[PDB]
Design a binder for these strands. Structure first.
Lengths: 67, 185, 144, 62, 260
RNA sequence: GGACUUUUACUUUGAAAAAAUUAGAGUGUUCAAAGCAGGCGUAUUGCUCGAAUAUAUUAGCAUGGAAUAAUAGAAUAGGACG
RNA sequence: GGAUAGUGGCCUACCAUGGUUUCAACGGGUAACGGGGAAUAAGGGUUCGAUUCCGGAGAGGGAGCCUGAGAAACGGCUACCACAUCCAAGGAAGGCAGCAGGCGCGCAAAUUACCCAAUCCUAAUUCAGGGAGGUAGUGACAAUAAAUAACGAUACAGGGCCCAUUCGGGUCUUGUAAUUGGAAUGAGUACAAUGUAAAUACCUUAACGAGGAACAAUUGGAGGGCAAGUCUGGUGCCAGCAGCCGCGGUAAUUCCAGCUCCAAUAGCGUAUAUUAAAGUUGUUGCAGUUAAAAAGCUCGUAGUUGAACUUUGGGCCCGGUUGGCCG
């Protein structure tokens, strides 16, 4: 079996320069539990329909429905 | 937008589909070298044609032509390295008289047979395509390998497979095991 | 001699005079008048699928003698009315009126085949299914 | 000429050829095996002849 | 096309980089810089295709972002920076001094020069102009402009520049005899003297050449890059001295050097 | 000694000339279609050959040729050479 | 002169009457984006190129324009035209020839999937984003490799060279099996590790996985062309077959079937186009008294074509290449 290998000069100096996908094979990094792309995207577009904080907008929205 | 991973085809069906003469000769060949179908001869018939053409063209040139000598001897040096051209038939005139069985002979198929190991090309067929072969450290399960000169003295069985050591096969191991749980205990 | 210009400068004449004679050749002329796009029932297409209108019992020509089992079809993409031949023993029972059928040519490149007259097409599929499968009872004509 | 002939007997003969089922048999070898069968048979043992050799003769002349 | 182009389809890139066919749709595409993008060499191709100091294009940047690399003494960090002919490149953190200079095929050979010599380069002058406020200036083949030049310096003559002060320090004229480097065309990578310049008014002067083997080839004035005197280079030539041998003579040198 | 055909066609050799494709050199993808790889070793801090070559028949440009085929020149001499 | 970034009848004033054409202008057609290239292999040619690269153009049709270095930009705006969505009926909003996906069209073309790990691009930028791009799914478009069995035992026939007077017979090696023998292997199934961004397949490998109703090869054909049946049964100028010649009207070698056989074979047939065959477009390279075809005849322009002659010959120099010979 032919493969490829790397030997860095210290652990954390490997930490730095290593692609994070390798480190998680080695228990050297944690798996980022992230939203799926489509869900991430659909948020980027949802937020995009808002100008400003939104916390102003929520007051705008909420004042309306309490009379 | 990638790059067109190129390719080409290997054979060439005959211009006339039904020649009792030709069809006979083709069948003779398929039986003694133990081939599978007519395509395995078409593949070689086609290969042969370019070679003869390549040489057909180089010969029309004035001799000592810079291109003729390079591209000719390079052609000749390859044809010899596989066992198709005689060791002292190293001329383009002698490659135009080359014929199908020269190539056909040098197959792994007809080498596993032609030096023990098999005692039948049809035996030799199944021996190759079942991992029972090794041009050195490498198993080679393609009948149409093509055995080169200094490679000839290396065609033997496998470090794996019962015919080469380390364990017998899995039908033997089921026979010597059924005479155990029964006639034993 | 030879009755054609030989001059080194006569290329135009040679070029144009062959251009002029390429018309006495059918396939050429057929290819430049775009006849397949214009006159032909298919649009030059290899196949075309139409709807069956009636069954025909066409009598073959001499010195033959039989009834040659065909259908009148209206091609969908044209509305063109064409008559095609249903092949094999009793396959005409597999096809019925308003059925939809795949038609193809007869390998005669336009011309009618054999002894069947004015029938330059053959039925290949009826109601989605091939005939040489219906005939061989491999599949069945979908209950419509 | 005449386009309206009789559709009455659409498949007269297929519908009256007495269905006889296929007599089974051992499968013939596929692949290389079959060609081996043909090399040996057709010209290694050499059977039936005539000064020409014959592939598929039914019950000969006698 | 509505504006400047920003991609390079990997197939339309210069062949003399020797990028593979497969493994992606795009090539690096040199940024704007010192050299014409077709005549250049990105740092990414040097640092991973020509030196194998990297694998990913990511690890290319990580090296560059470490400022690990100077070009002509200035520390360059643009992944696809367009380095070229006569450039130096100095990987300090490993004591390596190169100089992008031509193969004998037409490619950019990995030529290692000393820790000295990297303190200068050469420059073919392109134009010699009277700038404003009466100041004169020359322009070299790498977009270097040096104000106040030696009045002798004309167009095509090469120029010895420092590499931390600019400044010309002697130079070579273009006359018969001089030692010349061919920088493009069918003879790219070759070296030889002169013999003749065949001038043509209207356009395109050809420059006949002869190497150190009495083989006479010709190119266009544009491709000629003077680099010193007969048998006397002002820099270190790569192996083979850009002499060029036939495919025949190639093959012999291979099989003979092969074995033992 | 540099420039130099009265005005051309033709013919030689070069130059500028994308890659892929094609032809074709090397390489044992296990074979092959491919790919442009790779190969050797103290394989514990290494070494090393490569990624050729040919093709473009139009036109343009540069160049060696003057056979073949065109073209100009002194006739009221409004001629050449210095 | 104006206008433009600039040249320019680009536009405008004034002035002349010029400019292209049988060496095909102008107009028309194209089921016409151009090229790199593709198919066909004596040569010359013929046909093709929407489509991995380059250039061009367009973003439902037109025009106009804001911004900006760059756009006459459409995942920008403005209008008219053709569509057409939401509505509380006052109004508001959309341009998939991006990626998927739907309707329509049809002979005719896949998932509303995963990721930025690679390739490269962009920004204020190692870091963000990228339906570029990569990844899997569907996928007999084409292309490569090539399992569907191998070897023995025995009983007869014998290829049996003989010995040899005869059911006398040496002795391997063909062929035959409702006879048996153990060997082998992956197609699969699956611990694992490998692979991957994660998963998947490939490669590697425990445990498994070969005896006929299986791990059971198909497609077409058997008159000629053209390779292979004068066998059997059915039909009777019917049904049908048949590219072409033809088969069928009771002994059908051609239909319908059974059996056997042939050809290619994980592929084989059909239709449509095209190339070769075609020296049946003929430059190479055809034909024209009678098979298709010399204008009734002469003149004549454009076109094509066009007698001969001009430094020929003699004599040197220099440095090259294959063969004599020989080691």
């Amino acid at each position: 079996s032919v493969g490829f290998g790397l030997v860095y000069n210290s652990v954390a100096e490997a930490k730095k320069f290593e692609p994070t996908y390798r480190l998680v094979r080695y228990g050297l990094a944690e798996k980022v539990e992230k939203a799926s792309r489509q869900q991430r995207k659909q948020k980027k577009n949802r937020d995009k329909k808002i100008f400003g904080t939104g916390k102003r907008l929520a007051k705008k929205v909420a004042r309306r429905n309490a009379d | 937008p990638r790059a067109p991973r190129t390719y080409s085809k290997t054979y060439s069906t005959p211009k006339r589909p039904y020649e009792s003469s030709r069809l006979d000769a083709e069948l003779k060949l398929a039986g003694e070298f133990g081939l599978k179908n007519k395509k395995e001869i078409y593949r070689i018939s086609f290969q042969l044609s370019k070679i003869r053409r390549a040489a057909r063209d180089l010969l029309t040139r004035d001799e000592k032509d810079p291109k003729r000598l390079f591209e000719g001897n390079a052609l000749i040096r390859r044809l010899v390295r596989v066992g198709v051209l005689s060791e002292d038939k190293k001329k383009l005139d002698y490659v135009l008289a080359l014929k199908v069985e020269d190539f056909l002979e040098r197959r792994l198929q007809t080498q596993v047979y032609k030096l023990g190991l098999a005692k039948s090309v049809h035996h030799a067929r199944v021996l190759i395509t079942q991992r029972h072969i090794a041009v050195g450290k490498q198993i080679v399960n393609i009948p149409s390998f093509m055995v080169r000169l200094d490679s000839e003295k290396h065609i033997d069985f496998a470090p794996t497979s019962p015919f080469g050591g380390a364990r017998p096969g899995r039908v033997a191991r089921r026979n010597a095991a059924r005479k155990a749980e029964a006639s034993g205990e | 001699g030879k009755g054609k210009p030989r001059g080194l400068n006569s290329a135009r004449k040679l070029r144009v005079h062959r251009r002029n004679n390429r018309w006495a050749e059918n396939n050429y002329k057929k290819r430049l008048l775009g006849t397949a796009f214009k006159s032909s029932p298919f649009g030059g297409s290899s196949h075309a699928k139409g709807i069956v209108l009636e069954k025909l019992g066409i009598e073959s020509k001499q010195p033959n003698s039989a009834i040659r089992k065909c259908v009148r079809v209206q091609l969908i993409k044209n509305g063109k009315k064409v008559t095609a031949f249903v092949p094999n023993d009793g396959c005409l029972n597999f096809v019925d009126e308003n059925d939809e059928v795949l038609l193809a040519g007869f390998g005669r490149k336009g011309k009618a085949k054999g002894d069947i007259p004015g029938v330059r097409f053959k039925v290949v599929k009826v109601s989605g299914v091939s005939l040489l499968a219906l005939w061989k009872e491999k599949k069945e004509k979908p209950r419509s | 000429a005449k386009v309206h002939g009789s559709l009455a007997r659409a498949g007269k003969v297929k519908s009256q050829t007495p269905k006889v089922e296929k007599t089974e048999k051992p499968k013939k070898p596929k692949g290389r095996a079959y060609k081996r069968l043909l090399y040996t048979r057709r010209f290694v043992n050499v059977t039936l002849v005539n000064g020409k050799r014959r592939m598929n003769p039914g019950p000969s002349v006698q | 096309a509505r504006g400047p182009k920003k991609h390079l389809k990997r197939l339309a890139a210069p062949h003399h980089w020797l990028l593979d066919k497969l493994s992606g749709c795009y090539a690096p595409r040199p940024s704007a810089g010192p050299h014409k993008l077709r005549e250049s060499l990105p740092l990414i191709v040097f640092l991973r295709n020509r030196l194998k100091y990297a694998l990913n294009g990511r690890e290319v940047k990580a090296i560059l972002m470490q400022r690990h690399v100077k070009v002509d003494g200035k520390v360059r960090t643009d992944t696809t920076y367009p380095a070229g002919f006569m450039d130096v490149i100095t990987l300090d953190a490993t004591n390596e001094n190169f100089r992008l200079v031509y193969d004998v095929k037409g490619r950019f050979a990995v030529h290692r020069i000393t820790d000295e010599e990297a303190s200068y380069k050469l420059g073919k002058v392109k134009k010699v102009q009277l700038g404003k406020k009466g100041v004169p200036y020359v322009v070299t083949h790498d977009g270097r402009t040096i104000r106040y030049p030696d009045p002798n310096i004309k167009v095509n003559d090469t120029v010895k520049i420092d590499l931390a002060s600019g400044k010309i320090t002697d130079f070579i004229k273009f006359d018969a005899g001089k030692l010349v480097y061919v920088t493009g065309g069918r003879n790219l990578g070759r070296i030889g003297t002169i013999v003749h310049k065949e001038r043509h008014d209207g356009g395109f002067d050809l420059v006949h050449i002869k190497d150190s083997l009495d083989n006479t080839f010709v190119t266009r004035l544009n491709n000629v890059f003077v680099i010193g005197e007969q048998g006397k280079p002002y820099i270190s030539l790569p192996k083979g001295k850009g002499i060029k041998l036939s495919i025949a003579e190639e093959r012999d040198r291979r099989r003979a050097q092969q074995g033992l």
